[PDB]
From a paper:
The Origin Recognition Complex (ORC) binds to sites in chromosomes to specify the location of origins of DNA replication. The S. cerevisiae ORC binds to specific DNA sequences throughout the cell cycle but becomes active only when it binds to the replication initiator Cdc6. The ORC–Cdc6 complex (product 1) assembles in step 1 around origin DNA and with the help of another replication initiator protein, Cdt1, it recruits the Mcm2-7 hexamer to the origin in step 2. Here we report the cryo-EM structure at 3.3 Å resolution of the yeast ORC–Cdc6 bound to an 85-bp ARS1 origin DNA.
The six AAA+−containing subunits (Orc1-5 and Cdc6) of ORC–Cdc6–DNA are arranged in a two-tiered, spiral structure that encircles the origin DNA, with the top tier formed by the AAA+ domains and the lower tier by the WHD domains. On the top tier, the gap between the Orc1 AAA+ and the Orc2 AAA+-like domain vacated by the Orc2 WHD became occupied by the Cdc6 AAA+ domain, and the AAA+ domains of Orc1-5 and Cdc6 form a nearly flat ring that encircles the ACS region of the origin DNA. Specifically, the Orc2 WHD was evicted from the center of the 5-membered AAA+ ring in the structure of ORC–DNA and was replaced by the Cdc6 AAA+ domain, forming the closed ring of six AAA+ domains around the ACS element in the ORC–Cdc6–DNA structure. Indeed, four ATPγS molecules and their associated Mg2+ were identified in the AAA+ domains of Orc1, Orc4, Orc5, and Cdc6. Therefore, the ORC–Cdc6 complex bound and stabilized 50 bp of the ARS1 origin DNA, which is 9 bp longer than that of ORC alone, which stabilized 41 bp of the ARS305 origin. Cdc6 was found to interact extensively with dsDNA in a bipartite manner, with the ISM of its AAA+ domain binding to the middle of the ACS sequence and the WHD hairpin motif binding to the intervening region between the A and B1 elements. The positively charged residues K477, K479, K481, and K483 in the Cdc6 WHD hairpin motif interact with the ACS phosphate backbone, but do not insert into the DNA groove, and therefore most likely increases the affinity of the ORC–Cdc6 complex for DNA. Our structure shows that Cdc6 binding stabilizes the Orc6 TFIIB-B domain, which in turn binds and stabilizes the eight nucleotides following the B1 element. We found that Cdc6 binding shifted a helix-turn-helix (HTH) motif in Orc1 by about 5 Å to form a part of the ATP binding site of Cdc6. In fact, the Orc1 Arg-616 points to the γ-phosphate and serves as the arginine finger in trans for the ATP molecule in the Cdc6 pocket.
Residue numbers in the entry:
A (entry chain B): 233 to 343, 356 to 497
B (entry chain F): 267 to 430
C (entry chain E): 214 to 300, 319 to 398, 407 to 478
D (entry chain C): 15 to 159, 178 to 616
E (entry chain D): 425 to 426, 446 to 529
Amino acid sequence: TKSASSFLDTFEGYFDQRKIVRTNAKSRHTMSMAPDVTREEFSLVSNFFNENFQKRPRQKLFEIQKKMFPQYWFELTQGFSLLFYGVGSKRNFLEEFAIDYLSPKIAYSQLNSIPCLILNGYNPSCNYRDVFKEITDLLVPAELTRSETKYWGNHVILQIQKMIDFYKNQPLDIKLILVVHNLDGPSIRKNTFQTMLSFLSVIRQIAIVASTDHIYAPLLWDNMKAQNYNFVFHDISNFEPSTVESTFQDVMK
Amino acid sequence: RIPNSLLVKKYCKMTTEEIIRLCNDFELPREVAYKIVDEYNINASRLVCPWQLVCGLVLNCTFIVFNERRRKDPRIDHFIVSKMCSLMLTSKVDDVIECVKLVKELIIGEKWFRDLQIRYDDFDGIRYDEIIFRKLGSMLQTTNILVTDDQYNIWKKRIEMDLA
Amino acid sequence: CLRKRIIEEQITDCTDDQFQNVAANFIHLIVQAFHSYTGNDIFALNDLIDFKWPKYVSRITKENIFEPLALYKSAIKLFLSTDDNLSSQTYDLSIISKYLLIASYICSYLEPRYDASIFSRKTRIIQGRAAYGRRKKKEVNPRYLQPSLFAIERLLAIFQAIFPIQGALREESLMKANIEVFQNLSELHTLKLIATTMNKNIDYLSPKVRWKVNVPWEIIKEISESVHFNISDYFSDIH
Amino acid sequence: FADAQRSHYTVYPSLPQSNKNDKHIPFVKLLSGKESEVNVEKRWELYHQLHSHFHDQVDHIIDNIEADLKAEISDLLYSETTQKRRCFNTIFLLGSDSTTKIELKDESSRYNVLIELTPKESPNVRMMLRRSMYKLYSAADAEEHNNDVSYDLSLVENFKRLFGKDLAMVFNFKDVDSINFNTLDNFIILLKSAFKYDHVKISLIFNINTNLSNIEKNLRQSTIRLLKRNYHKLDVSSNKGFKYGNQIFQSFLDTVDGKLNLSDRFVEFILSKMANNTNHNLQLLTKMLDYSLMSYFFQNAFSVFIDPVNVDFLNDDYLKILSRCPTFMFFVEGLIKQHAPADEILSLLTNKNRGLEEFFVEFLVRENPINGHAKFVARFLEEELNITNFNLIELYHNLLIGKLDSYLDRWSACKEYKDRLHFEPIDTIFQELFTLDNRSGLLTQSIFPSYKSNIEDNLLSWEQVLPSLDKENYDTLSGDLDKIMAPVLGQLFKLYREANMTINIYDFYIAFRETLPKEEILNFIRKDPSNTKLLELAETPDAFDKVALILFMQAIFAFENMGLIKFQSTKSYDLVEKCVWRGI
Amino acid sequence: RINTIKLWLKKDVKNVWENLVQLDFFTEKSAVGLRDNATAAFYASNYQFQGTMIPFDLRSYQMQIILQELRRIIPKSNMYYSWTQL
């Protein structure tokens, strides 16, 4: 009604809805005339509608896709990384998949459990040097010697390359499960973090279980990043209310 | 003069009697006819030709009301499109193939399409318990390299009469 | 290479003057042939003399050492063109990356208002009007300048307009942008063929980072020749 | 709580000590839960035998391309001189990704160092020089078995009197298309003055991932004429000269020789996806073939019958499954239509289990060599005919279709051999349980998905992801809401699709406000027994708008970090811009 | 108008173009030269300028010697001397 579009969404829907609208046909209405609320009325009706609008169909959907878990463990143990794109929060999926299901099954099969490094990549305070500090005490690799370090190089990338050539002479058992939430988040989409996380997925002895939120996500990875990940993509879009992450972002009036 | 086609004539006046005749040609039920003639009230002025939208409607809302009828034989799958190709005075079947594609995204998130696809459990041809395991990429999905379980026994029953 | 040519050709009518005169004549030939090319630089003449010397000794046969003119008429091929470059095909890229380079070349030289007159081709069902196009052809030739800056949705829209047909009613043959299109687009950004506003360590996933091509026309014509895409009639309404 | 507010919290999951079962393999019970556990164990061990036999050949090919490449480069790196003797050797490695190790020979009384250089290791000329002379002094003073020098070309000047050996440094620029050429020709100019020192031998090795008309367009012409003194080119790419696609696809047939078959659609999908990617194809070959194998042994129970010892575990459900193959239907229709024996088709139709149970085990001695004859066509084209520009995958595709003669006449070089290179094969009954295939779109959905299209489809239609229910409505909190009301963030997208390019957020809110039920949600909002705050706002005479703005603003600030909405006009954030269109 | 002048192709006018920036007849668009102190010549040695990452024949150069000053210094017995007027 408020769009005079002849076509709808294709390339000609792009070319058709990008017209030029005059100054009187426009509707300059500020959102001040929207009926203002408090922060606590939002905070109340939000957490009401999260778990009381489509709660049983969403639990039905999670039980539908919860019998998919042995295929995820099979794909992880055969070398691939996993990537869970979709509408809604994939957070509790990976918290109920990697903690509950996956590492008990990995720990039994090679006979404490298998360490799970969760990584809240929707938090913009996500440096890769303290994350790699957290990797280098769950594996504790060797140090960078004088000949193998270079003239003012990056020590993290050289250490991961040293771990890569170390773990070609090793048994193939999962030693860590690295659970990245919102892999294209605002401090992890940058290039050296992705070089780190792409060189970590070269190692067979670590299972990467990632998740994305943005829609132009796959152009973060070229023929070198998408080859060292070797993702397998799984649309597990489950329409979650996504209220763990929205406390980080601005909910400004 | 002979007619070339019927989905050519621009701004031909179409009343609801022709639309309900075209709906009762395909034996489509009441609650889909009372959406096909009620949508014509909505977009009537902005119509370059009203023998394309009503033409594509009665194959888009025909494939969703008779979905289980098509799964046993592919003869009805050609029967409805050939009936529409000869009812629209058209020699080329491709021009009514393009009709449902041009009208299909015009009604994709419509209301009556939304609660009419669940009524027959169509969900673009393949039902819900077969498509929710196809969106997740499950290796335990039903690929059609065999024949369907209710179809093998009816393949068996057409053999006992060819020997007795 | 000359002192083996004098015995390969059985040349006995020679002395040291008969070598140094053809040497000085060759140097004068490179000078009067290539001085308008180089300039007054000894270094750009030294290497031309080093290049074109044995291909000039390979043209003396039995009596070109006595005359100065039919030897120059026996080697006129190496005194017209310089032949200094490092030399078939154009680029060893994929098909969708070549069409992505072509579409990024199109959208960063075309004004964004005039594309619904060049690419919009499908039959309407609703009352709408297409783009009329530009009235007057501007003869400033925009593809001499620096390119423009576009959003990635315009590249993906022009990409599926110019793409050839692929793939009987459930195909929907108009190719959508899968993983491989985005992966090849990021590969083109890595190979510095499409490029952007280089802020230091820019995020690709922002609605404020716009893209541009930085390959010239002379390789885009060879690319559009390789995939056989008529691109000469895309900039026909400018010159 | 407050653990999802700090980045990288590691978590050790505690575990129950034992459950004492065989659940150490992911292979579920197939045949709708009728399979035996020993067959699942044999299926897992059989898949691992096949996967190990494949990857032990893939690793030898992948570690043989390096022994071919180190043999290739180190022959035109040496064994040649130039009469000018004041030039550096130059090797342009075309199409190569920077992934190769270079070996330098003995050549005693002369050091040979390799100085790898990177676009991160080169922000200007002085860091290139300091890193290069640092690597030179390190790889000179550590290959000797004591003062500190400055890292510039003076070490190259007095390398003869510092150590006693002649220098031969071989530079190696890793991503030559990614360095500044303005820094690179400055470095080449700065290296050119090393010619006057009579004990050096500079060699340059360029790893180019594009064509050579894009390197000699960006360089300066004097550097190009310096590089035209002793230059060689070398095409290093695994698509040139199809030898490593004719050794990965050849070795995949050596694992499936007789047990499995490949479909037509599968090999043409391989050819379509290997041609839309040029840089790495020896990896996109293996990660399609392995994922084809993994979706087979996870799905096909009859994989346990690809070994000729498990022939006796034909239960009743296997006989149900194999009977409804359409090739067997074509065979039984053949047994009807040519002649009429009654009591054999009456046996093998539905009654006799022993005839069908023993009939299938005859169908495994058959071979019908597709991949047993294709190696003969490969050896004929390589050895007797000497044509090394053929593709085994595409030749195998045409041999599988049957139009192989067109592909053999594509060269017009073997006209006297179109009978010798001919083979017309047929189908063997029960192929269609033993074929690697893609007719469900599985290798498409989970290796190369239409990502943005799937996101938009789940945003728009949403009934293919959320169920509809018919019993669980009264014990719930929202039973009548799943049928009359679309989910917010999936309802707002229906208005986002048919909006303009500039969407006023107040009009985008009003269009969302009048697509909600009014007389249902004002009854629904008073349902909670515990809290008391949610009911008093329903006692306010403007409840519907104050509950509508919460859901609208939640959906808007949920779309925004997904990528569909750009807030233009900062310090206003009132007029959003649609920036993702469906179908593209 | 007419024995002539050989038109050199754009594969050989590149060397001429580079020889007229190594004689300072063209500058770039806003490129400052040598910096004043030693740190500002270091702070810019780590910067990667946009005028050197774009292709060669699109760098927006700038004249050192205008056409009026070119008119009076070229001798009037030249075959391009009429072309210095505008």
